[PDB]
Each structure stands twice: as structure tokens, then as C-alpha cells.
Design a protein around this ligand. Structure first.
Ligand SMILES: Nc1ncnc2c1ncn2[C@@H]1O[C@H](CSCC[C@H](N)C(=O)O)[C@@H](O)[C@H]1O
Ligand SMILES: Nc1ncnc2c1ncn2[C@@H]1O[C@H](CSCC[C@H](N)C(=O)O)[C@@H](O)[C@H]1O
Ligand SMILES: Nc1ncnc2c1ncn2[C@@H]1O[C@H](CSCC[C@H](N)C(=O)O)[C@@H](O)[C@H]1O
Ligand SMILES: [Zn+2]
Ligand SMILES: [Zn+2]
Ligand SMILES: [Zn+2]
Lengths: 440, 440, 440
């Protein structure tokens, strides 16, 4: 019986029961976290990780939070280099949790982490069997399973290779769904988990989940010195999970949309297969299985199965004040898309579409905070499907002179469709002094 | 009592009970697999195979996943050449499951596969009685029954001949229905099992089960250097089942719609009969019975019986941006097609057809993700029948000048019809070092 | 209590109870056969045969499937020449069934067929008392009763004469009803048993139970080199029962519509009477009683009694693309015809007729897959009856100038009418080496 922090009356519990049917979910609250769904899914994924793997295995935990995964009965190796401002707080939490259960729990080898902590505090470059300060590039101890607890700032191919050299059989990756990023979207929804992401340039917008603007009077004279004339996504993107803000890199995050099969040829060439074992409203658990040698041929395509609908809409917003049009992605629950099918056949206006949507939402299924844009996406999809209907062409014959590109303003992946996108598969090229006293 | 992965509340269970009436199906979930129906049907077909065949027989398992079919009480011989990227994972799973039940299950001859695995690891060219690295062309062990567990990249005539030489009495083949591919369609449906296939050229579409497009602005200038001017299917096709992507060859898969009776004349000439013993919403189980000698005369025709309706619709879509009209195939449940019969007699618009279809879907019978296409197919079939009504011709009199070819935009095979197409019947012409250590 | 394969909830069971009232039918499924009704009727007919005939008799079985009729307590003689591609697999099934019950069932004289099988395997030209490799023309052992288990490629007069010379008192024939073939139709229905037939030329149609076409664009230039300008039936016809495709010859199949009484004059002249003892939705059991000598005078006419209505409609279809009009035959249940009698009095359009048909079909009485055609037949029959009404002629006075033939486009035999058709009655003129090892 697994225990979950989410409130008992929350509907997301049911979704969790669908995401983890092999585990019995029991809700109870200890903290009123603004973001409880994400931690609940992470805990369930960790429990499934414990269940699936072989107990007689060494589990690498890259980007680890040592305090969380120390009460586990398995033998973990935490690899937490000091590359973020969050790391010192986690080291403090680990220190308190170690010197709060050292002599009161026996069957957890707590003295092992105690001695390893003393050793690493003494020598910063010592490879302890349960705690390592090195990076994934230069970690040392051989293991067989790797766990990525929501690590988003790392290059997937290089890290996978540098850990496959060490001998991992199979690595799991729990986190957010990468497809909205490989679609080149500006802002995101992840409505159930209350996590919204936005690009740096579109931060000062008005009508997205992640924005903040200021009221102005009738000045058409702000006269910016710098003129770009190209609103394209950039590398830096900011996530807001509950009340905590985290910066990610677009390239590093987008690199996690691994193909179904791929190869890593270097000094030692391995082959790998990646599949989604658990998916729930945006949170995914990928299973990249290591394999020595160079077997088979790779296609170069990545597949995503959308259990619930995906909606990439074209919305105008006042970014920094100026009206600009950009693409925003949204996740729509399966039932809402299911019931909004007959209506999505006519020439429907955004007003009528949004009225029907709120009437459909009754207890809420989807967050009402982001159904001015779902209605817009549905209206534009109806527009496109219609204009496609009475523009029926001829078999096997295009119209090339140079050929006409006609308008696509929204992408509506139905709650049972799958998306293939091309992704590269043939990967070829790959402490502080006061803190030492603070260790005690 | 057979045990099935699919959820208890899923309607597809009933279909399974219709597909396997001799077997009692009991539902329970161990994993939340995105694709559960396909594995369910595969397991049920394997249990049917165990029931039907003679226990005192040697069963060739070509393209085998040895881990799954090793717990069986029969004496299987797995043939798993390293021709796919998944094969290393299959060998790893076999190794773990062998060294996880070696000394705790007795009546399964586990030590046999243990010793045979050591033998093949030692000598890669040794034909062990339960495991081999060879290809179906060059396998050695004599047997009497062959099993094809969803093998899709192989030529049916050559493989059947090369195994019939070895002495198989009868070979079963469980897989997808090959009927849509001899119909020369671009995209596929298989709605119940959530498996959608698409051609190479139509991957970047908008309104099929398997597509992914990007929003673009008003640029009628993409100016492609290469101009084809012929939208015809090619050999490469991509399947997406659940979240896994599998590449298939159009010719190799199309070769599996074998005629009712056919002959294989070579050094030794055999005769064979192929029949569909199990069929459910697309999944089929063919029964090709070997027979030495040359008796009878072949018709050269292959029959598919459609328990549920088949729809070949002509849909426009913006592939890579450019709008073209291509053909998509769809499976419609028998109940929906049955209730939509009298309505399919009028001059019905796609709007009214889609509204009435979504009304008929109430709990869902068919997946609502693909009823803009079914409605269009029904409307066009009504159009064709209506035009066919008042164009009555004379007995035995054609109109040849060179004679008029008037248009069919959809093929609607009713849920009790049979479709025959001409297929060729007179078939005339026919490990790495680190993995070796990884075997332990 | 007869034991039947067809599903318990199916309506056809009721019809079966009407076809065999002397037998108690108990349903259950052992296989999910696509075609279960046909095998059900065949088994019921065989059991009726067992009850009717004298136990102290020798029963010839032409075109035998020895495996099926071996468990019977009576003494059969199977005559199964290698004249079809199905024969080898039937022999293999016979061999397995013989060497699967040789020493565990006693009161069936199994060792008899064992020894006779060894004898024929040794000498291919040996007339064993329970198995024979000769044809019906050149079979040897004298008997008194003959059975035709759905044998379809044989000339009825020649076979009947060559068996009556051997001394058969009476021969039964279980099969499909031959009236639609003597009516010169292109496509057939047999809706209850899900078996559809069609001529070679109309294979590539669109709107029959047996067709397969391909979508095309507006090319009115296919320019066939060969021009026939005549759409008439040919000898070759394709049957599709469930998922099984069988070829028949039109002349041989039409020869089975034997008259009520006929004579065979040769070296020995016999007299025979043919009658239908059991009829159900298309399946018939004829009972041809032999008699030595030349007694009585023959009328030369054959009568078929239609328990359920018969409909020959004139439908236009795109055969290979070209629109041509041909005749299709259909069986309509008695209840539907009875209820649609008042409506069949007015000028009714095909639209209204089909709407009332689907409304009458509610659970389904007749298969909805084929009620575009029944509606057209009913509408055109109503048109013919109407035009027949206000065109009253004078008593016994024709109008001959050469006399006017006016148009019949459908033949509607009511569910209590009988059809008389002229058929000729005065009939005047009439293994491999590896298989031998496979016998073991
Ligand atoms: N290249 C790299 N190799 C190993 N760890 C890295 C890394 N880059 C960043 N990290 C670490 O990964 C952590 C991500 S924060 C995530 C912490 C924890 N997995 C959780 O989900 O709660 C950071 O603390 C950072 O120190
Ligand atoms: N020509 C051939 N002869 C024998 N096996 C082949 C083959 N071509 C491909 N294969 C094997 O067939 C496998 C198909 S993947 C199918 C695995 C398993 N039957 C399942 O359904 O789960 C591949 O792993 C490949 O190694
Ligand atoms: N002229 C002939 N004389 C005797 N048998 C013949 C024949 N022509 C064909 N046959 C046999 O008749 C068989 C018809 S298939 C019918 C099999 C069985 N009676 C059943 O209904 O299931 C063929 O196998 C063929 O071998
Ligand atoms: Zn380390
Ligand atoms: Zn082998
Ligand atoms: Zn004989």
C-alpha cells in the first residue's frame, strides 16, 4: 500500500490509480504543498522503480537528493555535484536526517552513510559507496542500474554513454513530457500538476499560465533601441512547479526525446531502446535499456502516445506590452475531448466553443484557468478541418509550380493519436571550506 | 482460465471472449501498458496454440522472444537472429529469467536452456535443442510445427519453403490483418489496439492517427528543389503500437495475405492451405498447413472475412504543409455500422453523418479520435450509391468506345462481407565479443 | 440430443430447430468459426442421415472427409481422391485421429481403418473396405447408400449412374440450394451462413457481398485492348464461406437441380426420384432414390419450394470501375417479407423501402449488410406490379404482330411460392512418394 501526499478529495488520485494499477494508493496529507501531484508521481515512480529492479543491484542516482532515497532498503549511490543553488539545502537535509536516525533504525546501514559522509568530508575526491561529489561525466563506481530523478539540465546522449561505460544495464528517467518542446512551443500548461513553463522573451505576457505585466496608459512611444523582428524560441526556458521556479535549457531538455532505438558509437559502441512505461497527464517514465555492441538499424524517429489530448494553439498576447502571436501547448483531459467531438464538426466560434467547454466542466475535470485558449484551438481546428473538407484535390497529384503552403494555426492530437518526430539517433561525438565544517 | 492484462472495465474484454470462446478470460492489471490489447491477444493466441497442437511435438518459434515462451510446458526451439535493435534486450531478459528460476522451478527443464545458453555462448554456430542464433533461411533443427509470434519483416514464401524443407507439418501466424495493405492505403487505424501505421511520405500530416506538424505563417514560398508529382505508397511504413515504433516493409508485410491454397515448387514441391482461424478487430491468426507433394489446382485469390466493417476513405491533409488527398483505412465496429444503415441511404452531408455518429457512440464503442474520417467515408459512399441509383444501365451491354471509368472515392466493406484479391500462388523461385561475456 | 457449434444467443439456432424438429439442439462453442452455421447444418444433416438409414447398410461417402465420419458407429466407405488441394490436410487429420484413438476406444473398429490405411499406403490401387483412393467414376466395392457431403465439382447424372451400377438404393445430397444458379445470377447472398458467391467477371465490384475495388481519380482513359460488349455468366464461380474461398463450375453445380423424377438409360437403365427432405435458409438435403428398370414418364421440370422469400434484383455496380448492371440473388426471411406486404402495394421509392426495411429489422433478423439491394428489388417489383395493374389486356387475346416483350427487372418469389424450371431428365450418355511415408 503506497501513501500519497495529495488530498483525499482530489480527483488526480484516480488518475494515479490508472497510472499505477499494480500499487494500492492511499491519500494522506502532511504538508499543503502547492505542487502535490508532482511529488506524488515521483514517489510512485520511485516505488515502481524499487519493485521492478533486481534487489541485488547497485543503483546510480544521478542528480540525487540523498535525503529522500536513503531510507530505501536498496543500495543506492547518490551523485550530487554542486551545480545548483539547491544542493547545499539538500546536503543540510541529508546531514540532519543522518544525525536524526543514526542510532534508532538498524536495518538500513545508516552507519554506512555516516562513515561515507565523514570520508567525503575529509577527502573531497573520495568515491564513497553511497555518496559522490563527481559529475555524471566523471563518476567512478561501477553499477548496473541508473535512476534519473527529474533531472532536466544534462545532455542525454553524453550522460547515457558515460554511465554505460561504467556498466549500467538499464536506466530509467522520470520527469515531464518532452514533446511540447520538440514541437517548438512558447508556453506550456501541464494543467493537472499546476506546472507552467514559459520562454524568457514571452514572460511579460498577459494571458498565459506564466506571465506578469504592468498597467500602462496611451503611450505609443516606448521606442526600443533593439529590434529583432523574429520571435523564435530561445535556449532558456523557465518552469514554475507549484511555487518554485527552475530554469532549463531548451537543447538539453529537448535532447531527452530519445528515439525508439538508437546507437552510441565511440570507443565502445552500444545500442539502446527507449520506451514509455508509465504516462500520466504529462509525467512520463522512460526506460532506456543499455546493450553492448552494434546490433540492428535505427530509424531516427521518436513516438509519443497521447492518452489525453494535446493542443498547440496560436494565441496573441501582449508580450512586454506589444501584441505578438505565439504558439502555446496544452493538455486536455480525455473525457473533455471525447465529449467535444460532435460540436467540433461545425463552424464554431471561440465564444460558443468556450461556453460549451465551461458547460462541459460542470467538481472540475480540467483547470478552468486555461480555457480561453483551448476554445481558440478548437475553433481554429474546426476552421482547418472545414477548409480541408471543401478543398478536395486529385489522387497522386500535387500542385507544384514551388508549391502552395496553406495555413495551420493549431495542432490537435486526439486522445488516442500518436506523434512521430525526427530525432537524431546515430550519436557519434560525446566543495567549500565552511561547508566542510557544516557537514557535522 | 486464461489471465489477461487489460483492465476489468475495458469493453475489449468482451471482444476477447468472442475471439476465444473455449477459454475463460479473467482480467487483472500488472502494468499500465499503453498498448494492452495487442499483448492480450498475443497471450490468448499462444494459449490457443498450446491447446491445439500435439504435446509430443517440436515447435519452432521464429523471430522468438525466448523469455516469454520458455515457461511453457512444451519443447520450443527459439530462433532469434540479431537482426533487430530489440534483440539484445530480449537476450538480457532471457538471461535474467533463466538465472532467476534455475533452482526454484523443477518441471520446466530449466537446466536445459541453461546448458544450451552456455553452449551457444561458447560456440556461436552450435544448434542447441532450444535456442539458436541462425536465421530462418539457415536453421538446422528438424521440427513439425512452426510459430510466428508477430514476425513482420520476412518473405512468407521463402520462409515457409525453407521451414517446410525442415519438415514442419503446420505453421501458425498471429499478427495484424494484411488486408489494408493490399488495398494500397497510406494510413491505418486498428482502433481497438491503438496501433496506427503511416507511410514515409505522409508522416508530417495533420488529421491522421499518426502525424506531427508544425505551425507556419503566411509563406507560399517553401520552394522544394525536388518534385515528384506522384503520391504513391512506398516500401517503408511505420507502425506505432502503444508507445513503440516499428518499421516494416510494404512488400514483406503484403506477402502475408496468402491465398486459400497455393503451391511451392522447387527442389521439393509442397502444397499448402491458409485459413483464418481467429479474427478480432484486426488481429488475425492464419493456419498454413504444410503438405509434401503437388496436388490440386490453385485459384490465385485471397479472401478476408470482415466481421467488423472496413472503410477506405479519401481524405485531404496538409502533409509537410502541402494539401494532398490520400487514402486511409479504418475499422468500424459491427454495431455502429449496423445502426448506421438506413441513414446511409440519403444524400447525407459529412456534418450530419459525424453528428449522428457521435450521437451513436453514446462508454464508447469506437474511438472518437477518428470520426471525422468515418463520417466522410460514409458520406462519400452514400454519394456513390446515390449516383449509382439513377445511372441504371442495360443487361449485358457495356459502353465502350476505351470505356468510361467513373469514380469511387471510398470502399465500404460491410460487417458481413468478404473481399478477395489476386495474389501470386504458384511460388517458383526462393554476436559480438562483449555480449558473450554479457551472457553470464 | 444433438450438440451444435453455433453460439447460444444466435437466432439461427431457432431456425435450426425448425429444420430438424426430431432432434434436440444444444449449443456451445468449441471454436470461433467465421462460418459456424454451415458446419452446424452439415452435422445436423449427417445425424439425420444416421437416424434415417438402415444400420445394416454400407454407406458410400464421395468426396469424403474421413476424419469427420470415422467416429460414427456405421460402416462407411470414404472415397477421397487427391483432386483438391484440401485433400492432403484431410488425410493428415485422418492419420492423427487414427493414431490418437487407436488404443483408447474399442467399439468403433478403429484397427480396421488402421489396417486399411496401411494397406492403401502399401498398394495405392487396393480397394479397402473403409478407405478408397479411386474416384466415384471408378470405385469398386458394392454398397446400398451413398452420401454427398457438400460435393460440388462432379456431374450429377454421370456420378449417379456410375454409383447406381454399383447398387446404391438411395443417395442423399446435402448442400446449398441450386435455384439461384439455374436462374442465371451473377452474385449471391445466403445471408444466414455468411457465404457469398460471385462470377469471375464481377469480382472487382463495389456493392456486393463479394467484391474488392481500388480508389481512383478522374481518368476516363483506361483503354482496354479487349472488348467484349457482353456481360453473361461464365462457368467459373467463387464461393466464400466465412473466410474460405472455394471455386465451383457453373455447369456442374447447375446439374444438381435435378427434376422430381428422371430416367438414366445406358447399359442398365434406372429410374430415380429426387425430393427435398430438409430445407433451411438455403441449405438443402436432396434425397435421390434409385430404382432399377424404366418405369413411368418424366415431366422434365424441377420444383423448388421457397420457405423464405427469394429476390433477384438488378443492380448497377462498378465492375473493375466500369458501371454495368447485373443480377444479384438474395434470400429474405419469411417474417420480413410477410410484414412488408402492405407497403409493397404503392409506388415506393428505394429510399423509403430501405428506411422501412431497417426500421423493420429492429437483435437482427436478416443481415443489414445487404439491404441496399433488397430495397431496390422491392421498389422495382412494386413498379412492375403497378405497371401490370393499369395495363389490363383482354381475355385469352395476345398482341402479336413478333410480339411485345416488356421489362422485368426483378423476380420476387414469395415465402410460400414454388419455382418450376425446365431441366433435362432423359439422361442418355454418361498419391506421391513422400505422402506414402507421411502416412505413418
Ligand atoms: N551534469 C550533471 N551530472 C550529475 N548531476 C547533475 C548534473 N547537472 C546538474 N546535476 C544535479 O542535478 C540536480 C537536479 S535538481 C533535482 C534533484 C532531485 N533529483 C529531485 O528531483 O528532487 C541538481 O542539484 C544538480 O546538482
Ligand atoms: N528473416 C528472419 N528470420 C528469423 N528471424 C527474424 C528474421 N528477420 C527478423 N527476425 C527476428 O524477428 C524479430 C521480430 S520482433 C518480434 C519478437 C517477438 N516475436 C514478439 O512478437 O514479441 C526480431 O527480433 C528479429 O531478430
Ligand atoms: N469426381 C470426383 N469423384 C470423387 N471425389 C471427388 C471428385 N471430384 C472431387 N472430389 C473430391 O471431393 C472433395 C470435395 S471437398 C468436400 C470435403 C467434404 N465432403 C466436406 O464437405 O467437408 C475434394 O476433396 C475432392 O477430392
Ligand atoms: Zn559517484
Ligand atoms: Zn534452430
Ligand atoms: Zn472406394
Amino acid at each position: 500500500p503506497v501513501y500519497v501526499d495529495i488530498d483525499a478529495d482530489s480527483a488526480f488520485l484516480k488518475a494515479l490509480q490508472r497510472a499505477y494499477p499494480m500499487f494500492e494508493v492511499e491519500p494522506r496529507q502532511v504538508t499543503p504543498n502547492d505542487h502535490a501531484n508532482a511529488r506524488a508521481f515521483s514517489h510512485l515512480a520511485i516505488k515502481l522503480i524499487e519493485q521492478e529492479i533486481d534487489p541485488d543491484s547497485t543503483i546510480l542516482d544521478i542528480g540525487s537528493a540523498p535525503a529522500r532515497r536513503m531510507m530505501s532498503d536498496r543500495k543506492y549511490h547518490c551523485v550530487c555535484p554542486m551545480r545548483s543553488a539547491e544542493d547545499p539545502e539538500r546536503l543540510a537535509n541529508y546531514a540532519r536526517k543522518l544525525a536524526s536516525a543514526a542510532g534508532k533504525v538498524l536495518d538500513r546501514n545508516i552507519s554506512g552513510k555516516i562513515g561515507d559522509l565523514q570520508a567525503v568530508m575529509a577527502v573531497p575526491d573520495t568515491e564513497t559507496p553511497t555518496f559522490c561529489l563527481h559529475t555524471d561525466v566523471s563518476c567512478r563506481q561501477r553499477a548496473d542500474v541508473a535512476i534519473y530523478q527529474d533531472v532536466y539540465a544534462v545532455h542525454a546522449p553524453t550522460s547515457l554513454y558515460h554511465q554505460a561505460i561504467k556498466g549500467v544495464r538499464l536506466a530509467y528517467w522520470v520527469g515531464f513530457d518532452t514533446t511540447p518542446f520538440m514541437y517548438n512551443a512558447m508556453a506550456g500548461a501541464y494543467p493537472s500538476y499546476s506546472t507552467n513553463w514559459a520562454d524568457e522573451q514571452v514572460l511579460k505576457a498577459k494571458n498565459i499560465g506564466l506571465c506578469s505585466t504592468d498597467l500602462t496608459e496611451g503611450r505609443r512611444g516606448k521606442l526600443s533601441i533593439m529590434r529583432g523582428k523574429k520571435l523564435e524560441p530561445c535556449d532558456r526556458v523557465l518552469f514554475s512547479v507549484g511555487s518554485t521556479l527552475y530554469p532549463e535549457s531548451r537543447k538539453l531538455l529537448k535532447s531527452w526525446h530519445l528515439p525508439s532505438v538508437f546507437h552510441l558509437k565511440g570507443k565502445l559502441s552500444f545500442t539502446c531502446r527507449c520506451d514509455t512505461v508509465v504516462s500520466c497527464e504529462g509525467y512520463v517514465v522512460k526506460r532506456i535499456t543499455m546493450s553492448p555492441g552494434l546490433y540492428g538499424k535505427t530509424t531516427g524517429y521518436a513516438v509519443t502516445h497521447h492518452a489525453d489530448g494535446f493542443l498547440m494553439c496560436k494565441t496573441t498576447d501582449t508580450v512586454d506590452g506589444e501584441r505578438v502571436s505565439f504558439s502555446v501547448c496544452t493538455y486536455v483531459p480525455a473525457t473533455i475531448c471525447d465529449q467535444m467531438t460532435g460540436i467540433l464538426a461545425t463552424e464554431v466560434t471561440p465564444e460558443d466553443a468556450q461556453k460549451l467547454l465551461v458547460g462541459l466542466n460542470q467538481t472540475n475535470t480540467m483547470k478552468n484557468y486555461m480555457i480561453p485558449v483551448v476554445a481558440q484551438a478548437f475553433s481554429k481546428w474546426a476552421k482547418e478541418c472545414r477548409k480541408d473538407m471543401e478543398d478536395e484535390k486529385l489522387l497522386g497529384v500535387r500542385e507544384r509550380t514551388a508549391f502552395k503552403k496553406q495555413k495551420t494555426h493549431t495542432v490537435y492530437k486526439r486522445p488516442d493519436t500518436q506523434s512521430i518526430q525526427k530525432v537524431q539517433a546515430e550519436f557519434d561525438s560525446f566543495l567549500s571550506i565552511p561547508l566542510r565544517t557544516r557537514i557535522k
